[PDB]
């Protein structure tokens, strides 16, 4: 019976099990159920992380400082652990020993309680070839009595569909609602608690430390609650700060250790920025342009997006930036993005929405299909997501899309959050949104017929405004609209694609010089309004690629390199000479 | 799966 | 009242032992008071605390501290949302009806459709009416729900689960926080 | 794998809940970096405070054959929970984990593996690593909150095409050997 049952009022005396810091009014409820006359077994129900446990346990502990009333004084408290009382069962009867051993016990001292930790367990413990005969089937003409008092532990979840099942059973257990503390009360449990970690550590908690665990857990680290949160943070800040440095070791604990590995936990960088990734940020519109030519709206937009989101300007309970990028083709809409999240090192999550034209495929973003009993049922932007917190979103042709796919949206943009249809909950605080679409190239290319020339300009976004609703338009943070690339832009282009040609001739061994000369003439040909910078391609293919092809294959091109390229202006052909 | 047994002592 | 209360809120007992439980559960709130606060004795006071206890609910004969937020939550929240007086008039006077007990029978609090231009405030005003009244807020995106299939959920769970969780999502939300604000954002797309 | 391994050392050295869990794709290894650290601890390349920790394998399926009774599974799960217990640097390596949640000898019941586990975990008596799949930890893993809780995901994905050279050069004396064949640099690139 010893082996079964562990005393939890001894652990307490040799500090075994941690304090208990509030909770005044849950214990109250307690004691007022354990010294009720009949069914005075107590049941302690919440979210899993909220303490159901410590309060079973600190129950123990309050005991020994002598901070209960008198009637729980003298009491002792005892653990039940099912497998060790299953163990060794195959004769039939043991079972049955072990658990009226037990409950003898419990009725002949008439001070003691039972603490069942995860009691949605004895509904069927001892039941042996479909048999009814179970740990619940027998304690319970022992609980209605009152001679025994049992103190349960279940999440709601095990609760409602594995405890409440049986009505008689949860009728003598008193559901004991325990809801998450506040931000305050788990500042107060954190002090409590503190002396414990900071010894296992050998490390000390600043008084701000603690308070940003508390609210950092709460803004960047979902699916768990407040006080679990925070001691998570604390405890991984106790163990990387021990064993990080060999020497030059920092005793305490700062508010920068804190914010670092809520970082590492929510895959997010932190809020240092102004020292370490202040040069990153400031290079990034320059060499944004470099990569992208023109355009430089859309790039403003998406770097003073990322600064304000670092600088802590950022929308609470919005995404990093949600932007509309609209215009004609190869113009650099979908360009920007993903050079953008090159440049930032950061996952590119690229989702083509010309897939996404029936209704019906809309529910593989928030699921799976109906009836699909197949696991891996996750949607695919939600799993997205949650695998990377901090990634850009781009969503290729949006008009495409049938208009149910706007609808998700507006809680992504609005709230920040989409939820699966499991109920996994995808966080897109930190995700930057955008879209492209070509909705209005048709409007503005279109030519009038009348007398008098229309001037075509706010066309665009008339068509833009009949594709989407205003409230998706509204939650947008700004509609970009891409130009057509000037002359001058396309000599830059130009050069571009050649570098990017010497690169590939990089690796073959051969180097390409061209003339200024040449460039020019390539851009005359190449440049087209409607077709944007892609013709400039089939020129260099055409042109330069050509050539070199069939002497990299066979000629001087195989080794050695040293190309050299020029025209004449009589001519107006280029030249391609090759002298390895 | 979880079935009772009954043994018999040899005499 | 306690037989007459229990019935009236507790919904997921019987009778003669959900009467039991408010009569057992009474006496012992006596026994931890101090032994000269009305140990002797329990009023139909204590009856109703120990009701509202056991469902969660907002207990009868409000304090005096309720009634200070109760008549300035008119007013807090005409700091945090303007020029929709006649929305918060509408929910926060239907709070009032159900505390002073001239609320439904057995309907809710209130059951409103908030239908306007964008950016007016519908969802603001109900998501600060949870922090004003320090209850929890129970948010389901309504765009999510589209389909036929996804409807079971709020009453179930998938065809063919063979798991344990065969609960609904808006039914163990309203059980887990029965006291709280439902909010269905764009319901029409459902 | 150092920034691997440093996540996992750290959360094995919390007070409670060091358990750390290793989530990624199919054979991105996730199983080479529980049996790698346990190869780096011999080596001394580990903290001093994770020295002298012995880690241990456990098979779910031998511990499922033979049981054929109420309570032999228990007998010997609890008894390995025992030995954990003992060795404070005991490590136990679980993996395919998901399959803890599904019932080990549990019919028609709810004591399984994982439940018996869980006061333990929360309370740091033992140390649990996990390695398990993106799929099978959204939708077998995580179902369970609690169990969920006491484990830190840990996300392992495949480093880059040019660090799996690396990788396979201190692999390749082990497959040379094997086949008696010498790979040639340019081969394994
Ligand atoms: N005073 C307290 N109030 C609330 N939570 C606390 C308190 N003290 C400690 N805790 C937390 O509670 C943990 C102990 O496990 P619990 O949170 O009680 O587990 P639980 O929620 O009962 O778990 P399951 O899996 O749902 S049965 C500690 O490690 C802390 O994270
Ligand atoms: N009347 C208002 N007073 C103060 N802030 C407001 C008001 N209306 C909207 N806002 C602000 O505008 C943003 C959106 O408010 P919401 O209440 O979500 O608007 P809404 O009109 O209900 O939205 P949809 O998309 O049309 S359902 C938030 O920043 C609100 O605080
Ligand atoms: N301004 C630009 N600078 C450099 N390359 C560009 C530019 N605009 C377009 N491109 C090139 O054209 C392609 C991008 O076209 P994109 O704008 O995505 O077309 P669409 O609008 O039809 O989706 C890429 O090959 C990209 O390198
Ligand atoms: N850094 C590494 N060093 C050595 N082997 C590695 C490394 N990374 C991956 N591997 C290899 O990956 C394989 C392990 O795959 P594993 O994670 O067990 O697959 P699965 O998830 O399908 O069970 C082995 O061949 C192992 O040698
Ligand atoms: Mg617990
Ligand atoms: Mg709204």
Same mark, same amino acid.
């Given at each position: ?13 040799? *500090? ?5 810091? &509030? ?13 009720? %006359? ?6 302690? #129900?919440?979210?899993?992380?909220? *303490?159901? =446990? ?7 502990? %309050? ?34 020993? %072990? ?24 509904? &069927? ?11 619940? !089937? ?5 609980? $209605? ?9 279940? =999440? ?49 908690? =600043? ?14 680290? !979902? ?64 060499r944004l342009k470099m990569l992208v030519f ?36 190869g113009?650099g809409?979908?360009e920007?993005?993903v050079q953008?999240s090159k440049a930032?090192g950061?996952?590119l ?35 997205? #997501? ?34 699966? !249809? ?34 075509? $300009? ?31 832009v396309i000599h830059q282009v130009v050069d571009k694609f050649i570098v990017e040609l010497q690169v590939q001739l990089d690796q073959k061994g051969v180097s390409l010089e061209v003339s200024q000369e040449a460039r020019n003439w390539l851009a005359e040909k190449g440049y087209? %309004?409607?077709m944007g910078a892609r013709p400039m391609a089939r020129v260099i293919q055409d042109n330069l690629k050509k050539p070199l092809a069939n002497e990299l294959l066979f000629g001087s091109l195989v080794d050695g390199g040293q190309v050299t390229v020029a025209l004449d202006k009589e001519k107006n052909e280029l030249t391609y000479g090759f002298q390895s | ?11």
């Open positions: 019976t010893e082996n079964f049952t562990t005393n939890l009022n001894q652990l307490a005396r040799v *500090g075994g099990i941690d304090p208990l810091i &509030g909770r005044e009014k849950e214990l109250e409820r307690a004691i007022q159920v354990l010294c009720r %006359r009949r069914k005075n077994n107590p049941l302690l #129900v919440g979210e899993s992380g909220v *303490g159901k =446990t410590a309060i079973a346990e600190g129950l123990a502990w %309050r005991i020994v400082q002598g901070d209960v009333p008198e009637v729980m004084a003298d009491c002792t408290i005892y653990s039940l652990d099912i497998g060790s009382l299953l163990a060794g069962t195959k004769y039939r009867g043991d079972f049955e020993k %072990r658990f009226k051993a037990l409950l003898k016990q419990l009725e002949q001292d008439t001070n003691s309680i039972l603490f069942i930790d995860e009691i949605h367990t004895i509904i &069927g413990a001892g039941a042996a070839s479909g048999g009814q005969v179970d740990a619940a !089937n027998l304690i319970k003409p022992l609980l $209605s009595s009152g001679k025994i008092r049992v103190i349960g532990s279940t =999440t709601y979840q095990e609760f409602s569909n594995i405890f409440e099942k049986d009505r008689a059973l949860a009728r003598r257990f008193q559901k004991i609602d325990i809801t998450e503390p506040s931000i305050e009360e788990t500042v107060q449990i954190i002090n409590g608690l503190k002396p414990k970690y900071e010894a296992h550590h050998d490390v000390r908690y =600043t008084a701000k430390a603690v308070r940003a665990a508390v609210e950092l857990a709460v803004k960047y680290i !979902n699916d768990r609650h407040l006080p679990d949160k925070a001691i998570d943070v604390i405890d991984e800040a106790g163990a990387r700060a021990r064993l990080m440095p060999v020497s030059k070791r920092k005793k305490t604990v700062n508010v920068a250790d804190i914010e670092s590995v809520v970082a590492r936990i929510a895959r997010i960088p932190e809020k240092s920025v102004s020292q370490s990734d202040r040069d990153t940020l400031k290079n990034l519109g320059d023109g355009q430089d709206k859309a790039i403003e937009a998406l770097t003073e997006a990322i600064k304000m989101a670092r600088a802590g300007l950022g929308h609470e309970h919005k995404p990093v930036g949600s932007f509309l990028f609209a215009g004609p083709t113009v809409k979908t920007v993005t953008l930032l950061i996952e999550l690229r989702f083509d929405m010309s897939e996404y034209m029936e209704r019906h495929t809309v529910s593989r973003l928030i699921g799976a299909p109906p009836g699909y009993v197949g696991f891996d049922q996750g949607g695919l932007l939600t799993d997205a #997501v949650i695998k990377h917190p901090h990634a850009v979103l781009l969503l290729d042709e949006i008009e495409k899309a049938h208009p149910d796919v706007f609808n998700i949206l507006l809680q992504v943009m609005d709230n920040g959050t989409l939820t699966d !249809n499991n109920g996994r909950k995808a966080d897109f605080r930190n995700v930057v949104l955008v879209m492209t679409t070509n909705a209005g190239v048709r409007e503005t290319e279109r030519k009038s017929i009348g007398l008098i020339h229309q001037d075509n $300009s706010t066309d665009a976004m008339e068509e833009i405004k009949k594709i989407f609703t205003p409230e998706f338009r509204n939650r947008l943070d700004n509609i970009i609209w891409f130009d057509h690339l000037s002359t001058d087209d %309004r409607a | 799966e979880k079935v009772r047994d009954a043994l018999k002592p040899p005499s």
